[PDB]
Coordinates of C-alpha atoms in Angstrom, one line a residue:
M1 CA 26.8 -46.7 -28.1
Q2 CA 27.0 -50.5 -29.0
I3 CA 24.4 -52.7 -30.7
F4 CA 24.3 -56.2 -32.4
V5 CA 23.8 -57.3 -36.0
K6 CA 22.9 -61.0 -36.8
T7 CA 23.1 -62.6 -40.3
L8 CA 21.6 -65.8 -41.6
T9 CA 25.1 -67.2 -42.1
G10 CA 25.1 -67.8 -38.4
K11 CA 27.5 -64.9 -37.6
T12 CA 26.9 -62.1 -35.1
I13 CA 28.6 -58.7 -35.1
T14 CA 28.8 -56.0 -32.5
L15 CA 29.5 -52.3 -33.5
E16 CA 29.6 -48.7 -32.2
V17 CA 26.9 -46.3 -33.6
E18 CA 25.2 -43.0 -32.7
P19 CA 21.3 -42.7 -32.2
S20 CA 21.5 -40.1 -34.9
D21 CA 22.9 -42.5 -37.5
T22 CA 20.8 -42.9 -40.6
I23 CA 20.4 -46.4 -41.9
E24 CA 22.5 -46.2 -45.1
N25 CA 25.4 -45.0 -43.0
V26 CA 24.8 -48.1 -40.7
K27 CA 24.9 -50.2 -43.9
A28 CA 28.3 -48.5 -44.7
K29 CA 29.6 -49.3 -41.2
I30 CA 28.6 -52.9 -41.9
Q31 CA 30.4 -52.7 -45.3
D32 CA 33.6 -51.5 -43.4
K33 CA 33.3 -54.4 -40.9
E34 CA 32.3 -57.3 -43.2
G35 CA 32.6 -56.1 -46.8
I36 CA 29.0 -56.3 -47.9
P37 CA 27.9 -53.8 -50.5
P38 CA 25.0 -51.5 -49.1
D39 CA 22.9 -52.1 -52.2
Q40 CA 22.7 -55.8 -51.4
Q41 CA 21.8 -55.2 -47.7
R42 CA 18.3 -55.5 -46.3
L43 CA 18.1 -54.5 -42.6
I44 CA 15.2 -55.6 -40.4
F45 CA 14.1 -54.5 -36.9
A46 CA 10.9 -55.3 -34.9
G47 CA 8.9 -56.8 -37.8
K48 CA 9.8 -54.4 -40.6
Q49 CA 12.5 -53.5 -43.1
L50 CA 14.1 -50.1 -42.6
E51 CA 14.0 -47.0 -44.7
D52 CA 17.4 -45.1 -44.9
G53 CA 15.9 -41.6 -44.7
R54 CA 15.5 -42.2 -40.8
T55 CA 17.8 -42.7 -37.9
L56 CA 18.3 -45.4 -35.2
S57 CA 16.4 -43.2 -32.7
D58 CA 13.5 -42.7 -35.1
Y59 CA 13.1 -46.5 -35.0
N60 CA 13.6 -46.5 -31.2
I61 CA 16.8 -48.5 -31.4
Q62 CA 19.2 -48.2 -28.4
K63 CA 22.3 -50.0 -26.9
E64 CA 22.1 -53.8 -26.7
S65 CA 19.4 -54.0 -29.4
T66 CA 19.8 -56.4 -32.3
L67 CA 19.4 -55.7 -36.1
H68 CA 18.8 -58.6 -38.5
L69 CA 20.5 -58.6 -41.9
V70 CA 19.4 -60.3 -45.1
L71 CA 21.3 -60.4 -48.5
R72 CA 19.7 -59.7 -51.9
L73 CA 20.0 -62.0 -54.8
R74 CA 22.1 -60.1 -57.4
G75 CA 25.7 -58.9 -57.7
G76 CA 28.9 -58.9 -59.7

């Protein structure tokens, strides 16, 4: 099913995921679409940061929902 991801650069992404996807795999699907290393990604939904040990359905995320993405300060 299809969701959205928004980033503070002003860009929006849409992508295809399963409700059983665990969040570090969603970070890896974002790495495949936009190049961003998973260790620099912070993913936010509904007033919290996400933990990668749980799935989109554990967070009650469904089609047409939006994730917010923030970049950490260090790399290279």
